[PDB]
Write a protein that binds this ligand. Structure first.
Ligand SMILES: NC(=O)C1=CN([C@@H]2O[C@H](COP(=O)(O)OP(=O)(O)OC[C@H]3O[C@@H](n4cnc5c(N)ncnc54)[C@H](O)[C@@H]3O)[C@@H](O)[C@H]2O)C=CC1
Ligand SMILES: Cc1cc2nc3c(=O)[nH]c(=O)nc-3n(C[C@H](O)[C@H](O)[C@H](O)COP(=O)(O)O)c2cc1C
Ligand code: SF4
Ligand code: FES
Lengths: 430, 213, 85
């Protein structure tokens, strides 16, 4: 298989993505959810971890770590501490609105994912750390969890398997940083959402100091479909090391901004011109695309023509796949205003723990605020580049990286527009 | 916008706060979601529960959450000043939150911020004099394909125009509660000109299930 | 810790009084500002004994090896949890 995309509706994992079917238990059981869950759980942890490792599932949260290799870190004998699957439903990334759709429209798929993943990792309970802004989605998921407790699908003797497993929902309180897994762990523990340093990875010391795996809503909700359909079925999509399907959020300057489930290595132009109705003003009106939400660097129109929407082809396009949140920016966009508003987001959403993010993201926001007006001299472009390189890899979590990278992409692909901004400032003010 | 407390006569450690008894049963249910010995993990819900009863957080709700969870009060003040939802000043009855990050800015959130400002006669951060509307300007709310959008207290109002948000403020001032949805033709997040996917009926239980299961 | 590397020989401090004109610290001690630096303890002891100075020796106090663990800030059951970070 050399061409990708054009995913059929029989291959969709997230049927009822759009809210057109019943999200409750009667609607979910007639779409395939909770089918033979007892038979999956009674095949033990090793079979489920083998199905996830065989599927080539990489972490849908945005980093793309191998999910079965990640979840096998819990597969070890206990030492008195309980074990916890913690589901990352925070989703603070600008551009990203897919986990909201999973929680709002396919909640039992997430609950069965919690059960299957927690059985795979020996977890006692599931904390679904949901965004506090998603109040309707959290009450929606709580109604589904009540339907799962009353059907005997979770809790004491889950699905008739003799495995006891609770599913808790924890609401956030308005922090983007509480999507990061250790800061999310600190936020569940009743503290400020400040990221822990690594090591200890959360499989050693996680929530309450227990063994813990934090996993995205999307990489959890696909796991019972992987265990039913087979790992080879999931691995038959996308390129190699880029297996499966993916939810995409096309937003910004397209005709039809939408969430859509697509095969992994689909071209960006095919995705936009098929599911989004194209760029406003046609494809020739395209200026730039932030491929995967705010933390990934932008790519210009010449790179968007041939690139594939998986992890490896976007790393080769010197950006990241990220959360697969495609923000489209047409030729009428002030791109420095957009990237500076993005860096303004990153300084309003930065917890303040370590020095390079706490100081340098505010200092990058001040430099970007002068760059929008042109109130600068061109030697401050390169300086800002080095400022980004002083934040990148020097911080605790990757929010410092996620604030350095849009600056780097903007400079790398749009230095002359910055320079002409500054020189027209210099000629109209001096 | 400050992160130190100054005792005013309406915000002091003798401002009357106490939970209702049904809120105490809710707090018992919250504390039972966590292991014994980690009652402090219930700081964020219970404090938010204190905001859902009182509308905001004086520094006796913080002290009550510190007292009934047996945590130090500074450990509650850190949570109350870290997280952007805990209102440490009394907001209006409808707390309008306009998202102006780049996916909502590219679909003209500035027009709707301006329309709310010229409908309410206030600007960002101010409250209307009848204490009904507090207009602030927030970051990404996770409704990016439904740009532009706002949030009012629990609800997302999506795919907005200036006329739509004027209508929403009209039927908020009339006492009614509007529908939390996209004000365009679509329903939640689908492509607007018809479905580009999922047009088939779902296959049902047992489709594609591998052998040996 | 770069000042805790070497041995020092000082002397007992003598009387410093107020100058009647300016209030300056007048002294009559010539050895008041005399600090000698030695690589080891035995060099300082040999130099004090060589010059007839009655001396006394304090031993080098190192900080003992501490046991540090960042994960110990987040224990399941121990008191060594942090309540803030
Ligand atoms: N989904 C969203 O809303 C957002 C997603 N992101 C994305 O998140 C990514 C950065 O997140 P991070 O978790 O910091 O990335 P990455 O450095 O940490 O690690 C990914 C996952 O693998 C695990 N892991 C990695 N090496 C491990 C090891 N040796 N042993 C055990 N576990 C190991 C980590 O615990 C983590 O859960 C970026 O790609 C960014 O685009 C960023 C912001 C928002
Ligand atoms: C600042 C920051 C915010 C993050 N926010 C989220 C998030 O909101 N949702 C999410 O699933 N992952 C988020 N992540 C990625 C997590 O660190 C982690 O990789 C993920 O939640 C769980 O791994 P997974 O991809 O295997 O599911 C964030 C990372 C950082 C650095
Ligand atoms: S880099 Fe920023 S987000 Fe990360 S621990 Fe430091 S202050 Fe927090
Ligand atoms: S950008 Fe406004 S909701 Fe995400």
């Amino acid at each position: 298989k050399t061409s990708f995309g054009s995913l059929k509706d029989e291959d969709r994992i997230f049927t009822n993505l759009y809210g057109r079917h019943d999200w409750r238990l009667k609607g979910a059981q007639s779409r395939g959810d909770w089918y033979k869950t007892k038979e999956i759980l009674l095949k033990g942890p090793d079979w489920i971890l083998g199905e996830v490792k065989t599927s080539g599932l990489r972490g849908r949260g945005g980093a793309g770590f191998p999910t079965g290799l990640k979840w096998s870190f819990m597969n070890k004998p206990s030492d008195g501490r309980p074990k916890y699957l913690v589901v990352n439903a925070d989703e603070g990334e600008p551009g990203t609105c897919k986990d909201r759709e999973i929680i709002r429209h396919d909640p039992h798929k997430l609950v069965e994912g919690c059960l299957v993943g927690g059985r795979a990792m020996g977890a006692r309970a599931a904390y679904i750390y949901i965004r506090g802004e998603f109040y309707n989605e959290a009450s929606n998921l709580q109604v589904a969890i009540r339907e799962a407790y009353e059907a005997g699908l979770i809790g004491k003797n889950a699905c008739g398997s003799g495995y006891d497993f609770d599913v808790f929902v924890v609401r956030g309180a308005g922090a983007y940083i509480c999507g990061e897994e250790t800061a999310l762990i600190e936020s569940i523990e009743g503290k400020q959402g400040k990221p822990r340093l690594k090591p200890p990875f959360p499989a050693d010391v996680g929530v309450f100091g227990c063994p813990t795996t934090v996993a995205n809503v999307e990489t959890v909700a696909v796991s019972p479909t992987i265990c039913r359909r087979g790992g080879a079925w999931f691995a038959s999509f996308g390129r190699e090391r880029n297996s499966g399907t993916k939810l995409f959020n096309i937003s910004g300057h397209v005709n039809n901004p939408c969430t859509v489930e697509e095969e992994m290595s689909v071209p960006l132009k095919e995705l936009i011109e098929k599911h989004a109705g194209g760029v406003t003003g046609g494809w020739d009106n395209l200026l730039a695309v932030i491929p995967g939400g705010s933390s990934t660097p932008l790519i210009p129109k010449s790179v968007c023509e041939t690139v594939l929407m998986d992890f490896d082809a976007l790393i080769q396009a010197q950006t990241g796949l990220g959360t697969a949140a495609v923000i489209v920016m047409d030729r009428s966009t002030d791109i420095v205003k957009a990237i500076a508003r993005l860096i303004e987001f990153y300084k309003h959403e930065s917890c303040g723990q370590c020095t390079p993010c706490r100081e340098g993201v505010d200092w990058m926001n001040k430099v970007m605020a002068r760059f929008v007006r042109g109130d600068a001299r061109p030697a401050e472009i390169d300086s800002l580049w080095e400022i980004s390189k002083q934040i990148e890899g020097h911080t605790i979590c990757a929010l410092g990286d996620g604030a350095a990278w849009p600056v780097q992409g903007l400079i790398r692909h749009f230095r002359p527009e910055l320079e002409e901004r500054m020189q027209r400032f210099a000629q109209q003010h001096q | 916008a400050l992160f130190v407390h100054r005792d005013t006569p309406k915000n002091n450690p003798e401002t009357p706060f106490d939970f209702t008894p049904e809120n105490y049963k809710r707090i018992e249910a919250i504390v039972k979601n966590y292991p014994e010995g980690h009652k402090a993990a219930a700081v964020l819900p219970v404090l938010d529960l204190a905001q859902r009863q009182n509308g905001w957080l004086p520094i006796s709700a913080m002290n009550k959450v510190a007292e009934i969870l047996q945590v130090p009060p500074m450990r509650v003040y850190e949570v109350a000043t870290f997280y952007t939802m805990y209102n440490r000043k009394p907001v209006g009855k409808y707390h309008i939150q306009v998202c102006t990050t780049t996916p909502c800015m590219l679909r003209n959130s500035d027009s709707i911020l301006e329309a709310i400002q010229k409908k309410l006669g206030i600007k960002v951060g101010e409250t209307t004099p009848d204490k009904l509307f507090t207009l602030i300007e927030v970051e990404c709310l996770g409704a990016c394909v439904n740009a532009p959008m706002v949030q009012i207290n629990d609800n997302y109002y999506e795919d907005l125009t200036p006329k739509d948000i004027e209508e929403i403020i009209d039927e908020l001032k009339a006492g009614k509660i509007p529908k939390p949805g996209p004000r365009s033709g679509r329903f939640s997040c689908e492509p607007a000109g018809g479905l580009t996917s999922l047009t088939e009926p779902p296959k049902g239980p047992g489709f594609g299930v591998q052998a040996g299961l | 810790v770069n000042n805790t590397k070497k041995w020092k020989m000082e002397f007992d401090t003598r009387e410093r009084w107020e100058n009647p004109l300016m209030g300056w610290a007048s002294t009559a001690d010539p050895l008041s500002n005399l600090v000698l630096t030695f690589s080891t303890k035995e060099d300082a002891i040999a130099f004090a004994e060589k010059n007839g100075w009655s001396y006394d020796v304090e031993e080098r106090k190192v900080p003992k090896p501490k046991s540090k663990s960042y994960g110990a800030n987040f224990s399941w059951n121990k008191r060594t949890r942090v309540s803030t970070k």
